[PDB]
């Protein structure tokens, strides 16, 4: 009931042993009381890394999208090493979503080593299990065995109805994932451990389908974009290898489903000036001239009977002489050209009325006239060429035209393919004009280039008219164990890709949220704009060039920081060599860098002078020691990891406050939320996520089926809690419910339509479904229902929630009215109370933790000691937590080397991995999440508690308590101990 404090462990040790005499009865009692539970106590175990590789094929349907929606691929496994590195080899094949699938090396959900199907955004098929949301469900197959050498796994995905299906060795699998969210794009992905060898089969040249694709499906190799090429690449990464060494990389920009849909601008609706019958007629004449000259250059001739094979022009007249189905076609395309030009922000009309008088045409010899003769002189347009603004106009006109064409195609049902299949109603141009390659863009522009050249030749009046910050910013820093507060230090940073790089020195108190240079904590230099940032910005020197190196260096002997580029010392506007001066030591400084999307750069701390370039020019001969020179092991660094995780209420938060009033008569204990700065300057408003720190867990077995009654109180299973919404707060943007331990949606535009949901349907060999399980990361109720159920009423909205831990059902009520929304869950599941709210008044919400008649309060549910005490209580451990988007994490010292190549046309792509790697995982029981033990270096409180826990282990093991020693051998293993001794970090 009072958190994890080491002083109580000290008390327990004192109870165990004192004055060299150990009370065996007390030691056995403490051991039997706390060790067998394996809860309320930190736990560690051996794990291995898991690496996932995608096929670089993105498919997903949307409204107006060009995706086919029925895809199929195959994977072959030929080398599996069972029980490698004293752990079962991981190997899974499936599909993953582009958004939400963010694997990281080490850690993650569960105990660690998350593969595909360990998150709701991913779905995997093991040898005989279906993996979704870190949940494994056994599936029946004709051959029930794990992934083995010489095995074939066929995966087929359908988007029209949300279906994922698998097939093993030709035997179809009667377990399919259904009713999943279609937001985003889906790509193939294989997760694996060491000692694996597989080959992809994507169809066509890249792999071959040993089994025929299901009818209506298409091979995945034909979904590649025109300018894209097939190449294996990680989902996202913050590091890469290069000739100099480790090159840190920023975020990876990726396409979205909304990019596939063509979004044009309406043009035909807009009226046009009366220039159409004066000057647009001459432009149409010029187009006729140029077209006739194209045929003249070709083998075409003037034959009145139209015959493409015989090269005969139907009109066969110098003047185009085209009839209404032909002349009006030309006139209307020119008219639509002007409509598009006006719609895209430009003008239509004349500016120079003597310009067409200046135009003199180009006279050509009679050889151009062939057969009847169709040579009109090309009107010379060299008088006015295409300005860059005019070229942009041509580009936008081509975009809009191809865009309206593509939307017409999609409305007809045209679906994009890498190849051109009109019989299947598919083109390589079905992607928007922006998504086209340079060839198709050129083909859809050149004619409009001629048209705009005609426009200019006549002299026309035409004239051209929050969380994203973390998604587009990545931060790396030196570990806080190397906080130097004196001396003269040099370190170099090479920026291989030009971008908004910010490299410099930062104080140990740098918040992950604050950008570099926006605060005084870091003296950074952003050379993309060529300025230096420290609590602002100021011009400094010149921007670098792609591949330049900057020698960021500091002297606390002189209390200054300077930046040099390629051995050239950067000057300020006044000419001062030092970028900053008067820099007090304070709390010290640490190397730091900030990278943007699609950006790469090496960071050399200066460990080796031989590889330290430009040191003689910049640092040497000035008394400036290279940083980390005497380091033997590589310097450990820390990266800003973007993953939403709940964190408690900061009592010093400038905008929100939480109060804890309890013990009032006729009112249960309650936690009140207030907005400190509402109705004032800088009153930020956005969706706020809150949850209670302790969860409630359902029974492992679902073996069901005035003055409260004491027997019903003792025998009841239901639990109740309420939320009070105050007046002033709109009942529309209020939410009350429960969240799974794997909810990481930090959406500022959050909605109940954005919750993850998936239906796992299990059938038999005959195909008859017998299981219809449902999984979701959030079980919470719509706020429009509350606002409908109810000007603002002074009555505080009371939202009651009832949960049965034995039967497994969830019911919601509003102000004494029972809502129709019911929920059913599975045994052995833990849920956290949570509310999502929009600040609309000074006082908004209040958790009421109480009890009803014959209903047991949540205090019993959380606490075993109070499991039978009807009085509701709020112990200090129970706190409120909101969701932090981005935090700090520690990069691994070593990275797995997986070798992937293209074996051949028949063999597809060969992927192999045989490098072992084993770190240690520390698992939090209540939060259901794991961390590396080495990450505890910066977390001293957890380190202190763990050290005192080990001391408690020794105390209960003291004086040769051999039974307790054996019990401890179960938790703390010989291999774990040996690896801990062998560890150096």
């Amino acid at each position: 009931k009072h958190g994890r404090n080491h002083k109580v462990l000290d008390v327990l040790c004192s109870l165990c042993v004192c004055n060299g005499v150990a009370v065996r009865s007390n030691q056995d009692l403490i051991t039997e009381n706390l060790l067998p539970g394996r809860e309320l106590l930190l736990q560690t175990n051996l794990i291995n890394y898991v690496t996932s590789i995608r096929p670089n094929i993105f498919v997903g349907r949307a409204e107006g999208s060009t995706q086919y929606g029925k895809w199929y691929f195959e994977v072959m496994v030929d080398e599996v090493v069972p029980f490698l590195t004293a752990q079962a080899t991981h190997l899974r094949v499936g599909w993953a979503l582009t958004e939400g699938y963010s694997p990281y090396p080490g850690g993650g959900e569960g105990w660690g080593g998350n593969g595909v199907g360990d998150d709701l955004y991913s779905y995997g098929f093991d040898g005989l299990h279906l993996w979704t949301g870190h949940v494994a469900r056994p599936v029946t197959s004709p051959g029930q065995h794990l992934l083995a050498p010489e095995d074939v796994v066929s995966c087929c995905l359908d988007l029209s109805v949300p279906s994922i299906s698998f097939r093993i060795n030709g035997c179809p699998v009667q377990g399919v994932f259904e009713a999943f969210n279609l937001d985003g794009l889906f790509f193939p992905v294989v997760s694996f451990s060491a000692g694996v060898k597989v080959r992809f089969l994507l169809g066509g040249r890249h792999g071959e389908f040993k089994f025929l694709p299901p009818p209506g499906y298409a091979p995945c190799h034909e979904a590649v974009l025109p300018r894209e090429r097939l190449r294996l690449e990680p989902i996202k990464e913050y590091r890469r290898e290069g000739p100099r060494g480790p090159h840190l990389v920023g975020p990876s920009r990726c396409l979205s489903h909304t990019d596939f849909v063509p979004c044009p601008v309406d043009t035909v609706q807009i009226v046009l000036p009366p220039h159409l019958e004066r000057i647009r007629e001459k432009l149409a004449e010029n187009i006729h001239e140029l077209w006739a000259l194209t045929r003249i250059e070709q083998g075409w001739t003037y034959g009145p009977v139209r015959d493409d094979n015989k090269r005969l022009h139907p009109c066969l007249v110098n003047f185009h002489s085209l009839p209404e189905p032909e002349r009006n076609y030309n006139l209307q395309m020119s008219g639509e050209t002007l409509k598009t030009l006006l719609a895209l922000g430009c003008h239509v009309g004349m500016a120079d009325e003597k310009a067409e008088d200046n135009l003199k045409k180009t006279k050509l010899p009679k050889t151009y006239m062939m057969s009847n003769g169709y040579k009109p002189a090309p009107l010379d347009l060299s008088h006015v060429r295409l300005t860059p603004a005019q070229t942009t106009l041509v580009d936008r006109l081509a975009e809009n035209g191809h865009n309206v064409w593509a939307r017409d195609r999609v409305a007809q049902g045209w679906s994009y393919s890498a190849v051109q299949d009109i019989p299947a109603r598919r083109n390589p141009r079905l992607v928007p004009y922006r998504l086209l390659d340079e060839a198709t863009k050129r083909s859809n522009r050149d004619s409009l280039c001629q048209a705009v050249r005609t426009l200019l030749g006549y002299g026309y009046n035409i004239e051209p008219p929050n969380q994203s910050r973390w998604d587009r910013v990545r931060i790396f820093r030196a570990e806080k164990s190397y906080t130097v507060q004196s001396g003269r230090w040099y370190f170099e940073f090479e920026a291989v890709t030009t971008g908004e790089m910010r490299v410099g020195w930062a104080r140990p108190e740098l918040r992950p949220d604050v950008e570099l240079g926006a605060d005084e904590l870091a003296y950074v230099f952003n050379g993309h704009r060529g300025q230096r940032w420290h609590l602002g910005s100021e011009p400094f020197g010149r921007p670098w060039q792609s591949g330049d190196v900057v020698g960021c260096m500091i002297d606390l002997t002189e209390n200054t920081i300077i930046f040099t580029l390629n051995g050239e010392v950067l000057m300020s506007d006044s000419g001062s060599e030092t970028a900053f001066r008067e820099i007090e030591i304070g709390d010290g400084f640490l190397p730091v860098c900030s990278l943007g999307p699609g950006q790469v750069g090496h960071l050399n701390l200066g460990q080796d002078v031989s590889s330290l370039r430009f040191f003689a020019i910049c640092g040497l001969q000035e008394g400036f020691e290279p940083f980390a020179i005497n380091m033997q092991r590589p310097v450990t660094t820390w990266f800003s990891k973007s993953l939403p995780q709940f964190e408690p209420v900061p009592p010093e938060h400038p905008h929100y406050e939480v109060a804890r009033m309890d013990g009032t008569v006729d009112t249960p204990p309650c936690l009140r939320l207030a907005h400190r700065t509402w109705g004032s300057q800088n009153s930020l408003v956005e969706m706020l996520f809150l949850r209670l720190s302790l969860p409630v867990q359902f029974h492992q077995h679902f073996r069901c089926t005035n003055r409260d009654d004491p027997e019903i109180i003792l025998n009841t299973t239901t639990y109740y809690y309420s939320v009070r919404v105050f007046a002033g707060q709109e009942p529309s943007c209020v939410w009350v419910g429960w969240v799974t331990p794997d909810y990481h949606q930090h959406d500022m535009n959050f909605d109940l339509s954005k919750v993850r949901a998936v239906t796992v349907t299990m059938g038999d060999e005959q195909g008859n479904v017998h299981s219809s399980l449902k999984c979701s990361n959030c079980y919470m109720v719509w706020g429009g229902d509350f606002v409908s159920p109810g000007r603002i009423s002074h009555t505080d909205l009371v939202i009651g929630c009832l949960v049965d831990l034995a039967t497994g059902l969830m019911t919601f009520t509003a102000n004494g009215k029972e809502s129709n929304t019911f929920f059913q869950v599975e045994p052995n599941t833990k849920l956290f109370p949570a509310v999502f709210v929009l600040p609309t008044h000074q006082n908004v919400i209040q958790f009421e933790l109480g009890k009803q008649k014959n209903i047991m309060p949540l205090s019993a549910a959380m606490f075993l000691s109070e499991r039978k005490n009807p009085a509701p209580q709020c112990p200090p451990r129970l706190e409120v937590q909101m969701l932090m988007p981005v935090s700090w994490s520690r990069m691994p010292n070593h990275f797995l080397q997986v070798e992937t190549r293209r074996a051949g046309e028949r063999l597809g792509w060969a992927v192999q991995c045989q490098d072992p790697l084993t770190m240690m995982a520390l698992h939090i029981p209540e939060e259901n999440r794991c961390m590396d033990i080495l990450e505890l270096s910066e977390r001293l409180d957890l380190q202190r508690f763990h050290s005192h826990t080990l001391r408690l282990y020794r105390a209960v093991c003291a004086l040769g308590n051999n039974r307790v020693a054996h019990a401890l051998c179960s938790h703390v293993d010989q291999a774990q101990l040996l690896h801990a001794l062998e560890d150096a970090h």
Epitope: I287, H288, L290, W291, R306, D308, P314, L322, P323, E324, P325, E326, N328, Y329, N330, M333, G401, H402, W405, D408, R409, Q412, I422, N427, R429, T440, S443, N444, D446, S447
Partner: nanobody, 126 residues
């Protein structure tokens, strides 16, 4: 949307009268041409004599026989009479509509890609 519905192509002895009616229902705009195509089981769709709104008829190598074509823009109806039947002539026939006129387009690839095929019908020669 411009949907072209095609009906006809009865089976009987060679030389039997076969008239195919295709009507193009859709936006009246960009309706100036009318193509025809034939593909036999297992071979490509070659162009039939294509007529455009100005009653401009373009023949090809596959017009061997009688292929009387007659169109009408009053209700976007086109009748193709391949009343001559030959063993090679057996094919699925399709009717196509497009803005491109007289099989040419100074505009370029957009309008070119602006094709609107139809449901078609089957023709067999016995």
């Amino acid at each position: 949307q411009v949907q072209l519905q095609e009906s006809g192509g009865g089976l009987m002895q060679a030389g039997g009268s076969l008239r195919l009616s295709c009507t193009a229902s859709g936006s009246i705009f960009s309706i100036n041409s009318m193509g025809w195509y034939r593909q036999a089981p297992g071979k490509q769709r070659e162009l039939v004599a294509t007529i455009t709104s100005g009653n401009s008829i373009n023949y090809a190598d596959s017009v061997k026989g009688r292929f009387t074509i007659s169109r009408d823009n009053a209700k976007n109806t086109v009748y193709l009479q391949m009343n001559s039947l030959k063993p090679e002539d057996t094919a699925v026939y399709y009717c196509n509509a497009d803005r491109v006129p007289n099989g040419y387009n100074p505009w370029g690839t957009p309008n070119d890609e602006y094709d609107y095929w139809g449901q078609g019908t089957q023709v067999t020669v016995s």
